[PDB]
Symmetry: D3
Subunit: 340 residues, 6 copies
């Protein structure tokens, strides 16, 4: 019954129905999503107490946003009023070789983007939570969200609260310099994190780490990661790797400690909607942590949850512990009947 909070952004996602494009229809389904929303929503569905720390404008759209947070099972007690705008993006679902297309709208002028550390009573919040997840987006959105994130991490550390962080580095959306700038910001918060979500390529391409070319394969892989971990004395480092054999796609999760490495077996992956699916993996890892599960049990549970998120339309991973366990325990049951 670990109480988890997240400091992050709420965004509006607009999606045409089925596999339609924006130019084909005026119809849309809108939802309130975001790394912190997806994470906390899934954890709330796993029956943990969750609360989102952020800001929403004091208007009907902001009110609809808070209603959505509650519906998902997330407490909106620490969602304050500020600004007038909410960040958003359009998502046109792809099919086969036609890629899914995400188009972002203004994000930095949002209620969350214009709020600063002084707008949040971190002291009061930390006193009621055991763990706090700082969304990587906070570090890059604006100087104000970055300063707030850093202060929160430092504070969380002081209160001896567990700190979680996700790398939100997207090569394609960054220039050479921006990457370096983000490097600096990540290096500033990493010293305060206990659980980190990210990939090998992040360490190399973003944090400039260099792999022991005298090593190779797993050994090289593990050496680089556990090195990064001991440097910041991280407790857990986790992520997933996508692969594809002829015809099939697979998802595999990994979980490292400074002295251990646990990888799940490749899981066939069927992609209906992958947006935000990375947050379902993290939710599974954090859940395993809250239950003091072995690294093997946690990575297996989290990887299955990640695969499940790809079969769920939209960013929010709406899964339960029983559902995930049913997939693991009963792989051949494709239809469940209840209410009899």
């Amino acid at each position: 019954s670990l109480k988890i909070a997240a400091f992050g952004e709420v965004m509006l996602r607009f999606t045409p129905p089925e596999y339609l494009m924006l130019e084909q229809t005026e119809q849309l389904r809108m939802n309130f999503v975001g790394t912190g929303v997806n994470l906390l929503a899934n954890l709330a569905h796993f029956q943990l107490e969750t609360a989102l720390i952020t800001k929403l404008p004091a208007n009907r759209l902001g009110e609809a946003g808070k209603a959505a947070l509650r519906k998902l099972g997330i407490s909106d007690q620490w969602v304050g009023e500020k600004g007038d705008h909410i960040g958003s993006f359009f998502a046109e679902m792809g099919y086969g070789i036609r890629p899914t297309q995400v188009t972002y709208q203004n994000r930095h002028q949002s209620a969350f983007g214009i709020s600063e550390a002084k707008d949040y009573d971190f002291e009061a919040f930390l006193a009621e939570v055991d763990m706090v997840h700082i969304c990587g987006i906070s570090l890059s959105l604006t100087e104000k969200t970055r300063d707030a994130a850093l202060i929160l991490a430092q504070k969380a550390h002081a209160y001896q609260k567990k700190v979680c962080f996700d790398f939100n580095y997207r090569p394609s959306l960054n220039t050479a310099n921006s990457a370096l700038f983000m490097r600096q910001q990540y290096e500033r918060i990493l010293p305060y994190c206990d659980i980190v979500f990210g990939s090998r390529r992040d360490l190399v391409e973003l944090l400039g780490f260099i792999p022991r070319e005298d090593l190779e394969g797993e050994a090289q892989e593990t050496e680089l990661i556990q090195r990064f971990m001991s440097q910041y004395n991280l407790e857990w480092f986790a992520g997933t790797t996508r692969s594809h054999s002829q015809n099939q796609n697979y998802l595999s999760g990994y979980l490292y400690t400074q002295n251990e490495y646990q990888q799940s077996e490749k899981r066939p992956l069927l992609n209906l909607d992958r947006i935000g699916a990375g947050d379902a993996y993290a939710a599974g890892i954090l859940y395993g942590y809250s239950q003091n599960w072995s690294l093997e049990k946690a990575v297996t549970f989290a990887t299955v949850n990640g695969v499940l998120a790809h079969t769920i339309q939209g960013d929010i991973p709406l899964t339960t512990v029983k559902q995930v366990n049913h997939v693991l325990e009963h792989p051949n049951i494709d239809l469940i009947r209840e209410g009899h």
Copy 2:
């Protein structure tokens, strides 16, 4: 900041879009409604702390039901698991002289209908609320919901908690005997109520009251009601009266005490959907009470809220204090712009 709870039923409402009939389309929009849901939802939108005391099956439908309660701003902390079924009804929206058609499905075999007083920790709940509304439906649904409602009222009285009750007597859906049976049940709970919602016809047709034929008009009307009130020592009695001049329909609210009578002026009424609108009037009355408003201010506010509920599709009165006041203060403004 009065904390209000309600003991009642949650029902599924199925409605075809626009003004379509069941035989015209397979399409539907479903919502979780009920007297207690409508009431608490509106009060939560008026910014009061609300909580629903009831049961929902431990299945995906029940889970979606709790999610809906939270979305509306109602705490689901006291919603327990029980049964497998949820009551429901279909609502085919009418137009002009074509009446709206409501068709009920099984209601008594619901999770709420099969739960008894021993399934609820009333002691613990009452300790955290200042007022409790007992939905009239509780008294007629099943012997179990009736026994639970009576026990709750008695208990609420002991704890000196304010008690609210709504007459849910529908002539058309009752036989001669059933009416008499309900009379007995109402007479049993009325001694414990402080605020009661109902109409003159209820007192006469259900409670068998007889009006002073030596009197007439308002005087006769008031004599009968304040007599009923002093008999149970009720604090507030409120309801609405619908009328129609040539071409127009009107709504008028009234609020009585043992020594006073406040009636609002007739308000033109436009009917898009009247289902549950009676609960918006009650919410307005209760809100006025929580703010210690004059009888005039409360009845005026509540009547406008009632008219507004008729313009809102569905049972849930999703109005705010500012919205109601804007209608009162700015009758000619039909379009509001925000977020500038």
Copy 3:
């Protein structure tokens, strides 16, 4: 329990939702309608045995058409296979002063339009029905549908079967000559009809009748109509008249015999969709006939049914005897609850 058949056309109606225009959305709801469909559908809902005599292409669209006829309660036993096309039209619903816009597609190349008398076993059909309604459209669609309609009327007369006919003359969609041509065709079938649906303007503008200018008002009106009736020895002549006072619109029905005249009182009319509403009036008249009702009872019942059809989206008048009677007997009840 009069068994009624109709000889007519089935058409596809495409309607964008709400009050949207074709240029605003790609969305549509399609339905199978037509004078004969609307008529028989309503009569089937009034619990009479009905059957449509027509043709539909032997393809999936034609099959969906027969399924729709059955759903409405109309027997599809006499619906034969022929052609490949089905007539259709688009209906963009108007609002306020913006008129409803109907746009027709090819109608004469339909399965019904290319079928001739020899394609129908009228002898066998007439042997199982007591009344047959010949849709006025049959006389103008094509020479083949016209020849079939005339033969059916003659035959129906021989078998001493009651014959009903509706004037389907639309001034706006006819040239000077076409009107004259249709005059001839109507004069050919009228000698075989018992019950006729039409208006005063039809007699004057289409049948070239001339009113006694020495008379005026009702007397003149009645003289012209009963004159037309005795000439063809018609049993019943019925129709409706639309009027408008300041602010309100009204509908009024009239029913004539060679020696009587019954007019209903003006009924306030609210227009959501008037397409095909004329067929609901006729259905009410025919129903009154089947029940051997007085002219007053029939015209009152039919006029209310006509008003109700205007509140129902789409051409099909989906009303029941109880519903109509409820409107007459309980004018102030706008919401009906059942299933308790």
Copy 4:
């Protein structure tokens, strides 16, 4: 042109669009389904005369239900009025490893569940049908539906009418005792059946049959089934077996007689919606029977029909003989053009 009737239940199925969950949208498509509905609907589409024997409440929902039966091509002549409720369930469509979730609502308090043998004129019905299918659900729903089913089977036998029956045993929804109770009820009706639908596991797990452990493979399989068949002197026993190789899923149908065994070749299976697909297989078997087809032709036709049902959204197998034959005869044609 075999005339087939079915004694069974009509249920409401609620399904959110696409692959959405109940917690994601208020939107739904509702349909009238049930074993007897699915079966007769498919057979009617195969052009056989069909009629459903059951009860529906005398309200608008019940009326919409009868309209749906007719639309599907099923006669509603023997659908009587009774009760007020209709059983129902929600179906949230799964995708990939996310299973489809079915949630049932009250089923036993339905119009069909409260009706007894005395409410049905079986004598009159049997006189107009050549075959009658008794839905296995009848035996377990309520004592009243069970007693009615047994009486109907006995009667059908007396009139020498062919009797069909489907095992509706779901391990997951039964306790140890309930299974035994159902065993008894099945043993009571089996002596009257000619054609039975079920699986090997039913015989072993439900009917407690024991396989010759001295045998193995097909021989053992066949020995057990033909033993069960001769015991009740059944004419046909049929069912399907689902299997899965790496990557692909398959469906295979089997048809036994007391002296023969016909199995179809594995057919690749693509699952869009499997609910009720078992009734499409049965419809194919019964159709083959009505045409006096060889066991090979019947099992091949039925298996393809079963695969097709999985590609059709919803429970109702809306297939035609030509469509099934086209799949068999032209496996590479994925697009058919008509109406040219």
Copy 5:
């Protein structure tokens, strides 16, 4: 065949269907609107050549925006690429006394808001148009759009091109100072305008004009307006006035010159959606101008067009000259049939 261009903003409008609120559904219909879009769209439907001068981001959303402009009949030749964001707002449709609620999102960080005069080849554009409408929003959105608007007006004047301008002053969305600031900007562009759209209250409340208190009624009204007009030597000044008698609402249009005044008779107004309806009135006025119509004919035509826009869902006035004339010439025809 006057060629008209407009310099303005394109915005995204999100609207839930029917009269639903944001908190009731995730469903939306999105459209590309804006003063310049609404104006040019209607004029294009009136068959004039139109072109919008603005910027849209070079992304899929911007591309969908240009597609919408073309669909409406507006040339997108002068729509350049710039920025990444598009302004937007949500519109929850009201009903009866429940007002319509508009909630704006970020508008100043749009592609249009960040573009400056140097980004537009006004010289080249002006050479191909006879008239240019400068949207009042340009003057208040950003300093860059303001500077561009002013430069365009000056240039248009030099080329002797007709210049149109609309007051976009909304009291409710402005502070005391902002109003004064806008006063200055309007005073700067007014000297270059020929046709101006606005109301009396704009002159008084925004431009600080003072009415001759020694005068009254029409005389006073006209004195103030023709004074404002001669000061800037304006050619035409037009607008509308909304009024309401008991039960009904009315719309009335007025058109002034320095020496004349033409007012239309009050037109009953039915409000389905008034957003942008003001642009339909302007389109009617401009159309009358392009046809060199009398002031009476222009104001009558424009007022009817304005009333029609209120019956059309959405901001875009999709009316034609024939449609408007049909309403004027045939007030009692509520249904038009074509394609016969």
Copy 6:
């Protein structure tokens, strides 16, 4: 920047949502499609100037049709008014082994079908285009469209304009004689074509060509095609071949000249909607031509475009050059993010 025009037909396509059948829902999405529309739409998206030469009725449906052409980026300048009807078809999307079902409505009585060469100012059009594509449908629809197509080809040749033509021969929709008749018409236009789209089977089955039985495989294949090409002195001949290995389907494109042969490698094909996908391949070929690309580059680009069209719902291939190139250059990127 090649300016391309097409002479062809516009049709209405009606499609139920998802994979629903006509008998399952009244809902539909309608679109304006046709060989010429699909072709020009894709080319316009590839940024070439396009214009459709055809006729549309002068009614609201025809107007909506022109609006759709513009939205797609196609100039509607040469779309004239004529007739009253528009051809159409219904498309029920298949799934797995359930084929997609297309049902045509009347096509020959359309505005395009009743127009003749004298209704088109080919001289004026040809003067503004560099290439003209004559849709094969023109040759078979009606004698009038055929005569117009032939005249246009002859004229285009005179003006030395590039001429493109597509074989629109569907074996299944033709009798023995009709095929021969079409042979004659194709032989008449082929002498004027430069670029032709079709398959080997067309040459053999329609044009009666005979393959060198002394040859085999590729050599035989190429001999037959280059023989057909030199006979009419064609410049380019292109088409695609569908194949299927166990489990997978593939698409392969080929491009021939009189002296060369270029075939693309098999591309895995995923079929969501193949209707009109053949026009996306042609658009890719023509685009390659306009860019003077090598045969290899053109066939590779076009085949990928063809595969992409199968993943797009509806007939219109809405792809861009960058999108196609992204699929070729980045095969493993299934999600693209923009607007950052």
